[PDB]
RNA sequence: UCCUCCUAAAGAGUAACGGAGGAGCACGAAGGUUGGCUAAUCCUGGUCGGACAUCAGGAGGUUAGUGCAAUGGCAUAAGCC
RNA sequence: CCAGGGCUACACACGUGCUACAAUGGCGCAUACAAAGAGAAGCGACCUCGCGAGAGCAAGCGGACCUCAUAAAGUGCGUCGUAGUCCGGAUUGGAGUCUGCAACUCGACUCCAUGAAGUCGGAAUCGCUAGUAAUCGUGGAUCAGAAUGCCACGGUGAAUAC
């Protein structure tokens, strides 16, 4: 909807990426950084984004590139 | 007067009975109907079937009622199926834009419950 | 067949927007000129759009640019 | 009868080259197509079966039979013997005409036409579809139509089986998926 | 009738909210038909007080008693409005 | 008072404040004759239409039906036009 | 002190507003007349690009000079023919722009598509005595961005008071 020119990733979370797809899959990434867009480079991956209390853990498949890590992450509780 | 599957749209003038396709707006008619060389204040009673066929053609390129009401449900069914916030909404007949829902709420709820 | 009890059933000729004659007899008023027969229609082309649509990493690499 | 010609001189050599028949009859010949709509609402207003049986006279070339109710079930409001719907029996030479008037010029006009339906088929090799909307025949003008209701149009053959039945209809290039 | 139950620093329980609704499904019938009420609560260190605002097809008319435990407060509050309804009501016959 | 079954002991008949049910009509066609026809219920497929409406096909073989109880009948139909 | 979330949750109840339900109008084109106010990490012409929001280049201006800045209703012509309609602009999908480290939760705007309730409103209730009510647009403070609120400004302009 925004953001014309490059998709936003944080730094701690970019490359701990790059250290954690090379060297074979790793713990769910403990990341609070909800800003952050999926790239191709976290498919198949587990990832924990923080929700408010806890860290959900998120398997990245491969069709979730356009959203952020945050839209998989609910916040409020409902019934 | 046979147009993307209905249209039947009689003595309406040209942009505007165009517009019963469900695809196309007052904008796209008025787009369409300049790629193929029709005045837009003629009402269709007047069109022959020589004039009829550039229409249909024209329409084809532009996704119309037979896919175009297939693809805005592919959306929501991946949306709903992959498990998103506006999934979530969608799953629950709840509004998605980050409206309001304490007080209004009420074109996406329906009716009003007690 | 029973007479006077049917409808009266007419030999008619059937032309199309893509240039076909057709000859049917049927039931109908003047003539017959229709729109969509089985040729000019997308049910022998026109079914490849149907999941060879979506992709979200195709949507992605043009934001990419790196 | 410009198609049952087209069964005279291509498809008996084109079903027995896939069956290997060893005789001539044993291939599936069509008997009749039957075109059953029926009403239901004829327990409110007798009157709205008439103008529906008027749209078989028209699709068809020729009057339906007004079909009585069977048993007497409380389930839709109906006694046994009362008129609930109207079928009609195509034979011969004018469900020939009913047959290419349906798979050329007809189910083309229905709307969302992708492939129809293959395994819609009885068990014993008979086909059986159903249209939606009477606007799909061209001799319904939708003009002088007062309720949109729809039918139901069965072909059935001397097929064995069910592929037997497919292979039938796919002959004459009838629409799959 | 619609009830609207408030609490200043008084969070309202559930044996508490249908009190006030039998209570004042009293000054109901026998007294007046009435429209909307706004009923208030409040504790301030000694004085359990109570308020109300009935909407009535005349005007409003509004009362408050203070009381001993939240339960006499309101007794005393139907009292005071009923009272008032039966002199609009009066008001409003002159046969 | 009348009809049907059982009691009733393989002809008929056979009692009890024995066990169960019905009748006090209907019908000008629901009578006569000629001509034709064959159900119930499930299964698969099919517009709304489902556990059940109409259609097609199969299985089934009278488990239907009979103006009204029950018994005896009924396909050559006594059943349905 | 810091990150993330929440203050934006929603079976509901109430208060204040906005847009409406149309023909005294909707839309398309042509076109006439304002006041008041703001502007330096600011206002930003003209010229190009884009359907558009805007982007590039970039003068001018601490301002009776320059910019925001076309005032709109009105008027001229044409069309719609009383229909949930060419009324209504909600909802949702797709594609975009700007701001900011970052618009997922949770911004504004544009484009394309979708076209909901709504056909003048129950009991009850509110404001207004004249440039008033009713309508039409404009500007400001708050402010990176973010008003249908608030505070101001003018245009048209009533009815009625025994």
Known sequence: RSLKKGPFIDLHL???????????????????????????????????????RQHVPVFVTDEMVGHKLGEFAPTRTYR | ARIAGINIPDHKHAVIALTSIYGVGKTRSKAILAAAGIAEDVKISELSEGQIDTLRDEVAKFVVEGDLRREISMSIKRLMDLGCYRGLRHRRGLPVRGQRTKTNARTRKGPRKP | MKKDIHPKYEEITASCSCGNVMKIRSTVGHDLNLDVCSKCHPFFTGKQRDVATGGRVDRFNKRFNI | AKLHDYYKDEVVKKLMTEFNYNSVMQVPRVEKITLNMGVGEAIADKKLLDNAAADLAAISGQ?????????????????????????????????????????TIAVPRIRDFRGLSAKSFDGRGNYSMGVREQIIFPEI????????????????????????????????????? | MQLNITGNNVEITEALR????????????????????????????????????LHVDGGELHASAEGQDMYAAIDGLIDKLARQLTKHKDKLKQH
């Open chain 4, 63 to 103: 009057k339906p039979l007004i079909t009585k109710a069977r048993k007497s079930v409380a389930g839709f409001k109906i006694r046994q013997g009362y008129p609930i719907g109207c079928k009609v029996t195509l034979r011969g030479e004018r469900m020939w005409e009913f047959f290419e008037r349906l798979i």
């Open chain 4, 141 to 177: 003008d939708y003009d002088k139509v007062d309720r949109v209701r729809g039918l139901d149009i069965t072909i059935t053959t001397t097929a064995k089986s069910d592929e037997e039945g497919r292979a039938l209809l796919a002959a004459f290039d009838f629409p799959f998926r």
């Open chain 5, 18 to 53: 249908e009190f006030v609704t039998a209570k004042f499904a009293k000054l109901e019938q026998y007294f007046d038909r009435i429209n909307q009420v706004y009923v208030v609560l409040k504790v301030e260190k000694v004085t359990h007080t109570s308020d109300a605002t």
């Open chain 1, 14 to 52: 970019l490359k701990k990426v790059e250290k954690a797809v090379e060297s074979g899959d790793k713990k769910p990434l403990r990341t609070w950084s909800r800003r952050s867009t999926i790239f191709p480079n976290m498919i198949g991956l587990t990832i924990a984004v923080h929700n408010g």
